[PDB]
């Protein structure tokens, strides 16, 4: 289908969930990055994706979906230039459960400031992944990241 999403999750008191990805994930084990990010199934919206994934990565309930990136679009080249493009529109949500995270899916994660988050995603991008990144370094979606929590 070449569709994509991404969600940045953050709880009542504002924190953003930086995830690691397991190491028995094919692609980017071990990475530090947003909440969740994935592809919806057949005759699923992306909303109903974000749910669905959120709920199995993580085992947790969320609302208040909210776009902050829409027209995102991840591109990726492998060393033969053979490139992928897609679609990833990026979305903010708030946990509304406690975390129950799968551990072969999610290896660590941490309840972090934005603000402190960014400072490293700018300094040291590297030790990221390169979408989150990307999704970050948009001044209007980083805005809306920024602001998400106050409404």
């Known amino acids: 289908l070449h569709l994509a999403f991404s969600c940045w999750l953050f709880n009542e008191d504002g924190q953003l969930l930086v995830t690691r990805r397991s190491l028995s994930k094919k692609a980017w084990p071990g990475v530090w990055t ?7 199934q057949q005759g699923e919206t992306t909303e ?31 060393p033969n230039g053979i490139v ?16 129950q995270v799968n551990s072969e899916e999610v290896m660590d994660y941490q309840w972090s400031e934005f603000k402190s988050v960014w400072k490293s995603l700018l300094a040291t991008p590297w030790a990221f992944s390169p979408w989150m990144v990307m999704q970050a370094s948009d001044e209007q979606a980083r805005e809306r990241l920024l602001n998400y929590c106050q409404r």
Request: aromatic share 10%; with cysteine.
């Open 84 to 99: 992928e493009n897609e679609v990833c529109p990026v979305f903010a949500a708030r946990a509304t459960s406690v975390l």
């Open 48 to 78: 109903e994706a974000i749910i669905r994934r959120c709920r199995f990565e993580l085992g947790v309930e969320i609302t208040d979906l909210t776009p902050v990136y829409p027209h995102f679009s991840y591109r990726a080249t492998d």
């Open 34 to 40: 947003n909440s969740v990010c994935g592809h919806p």
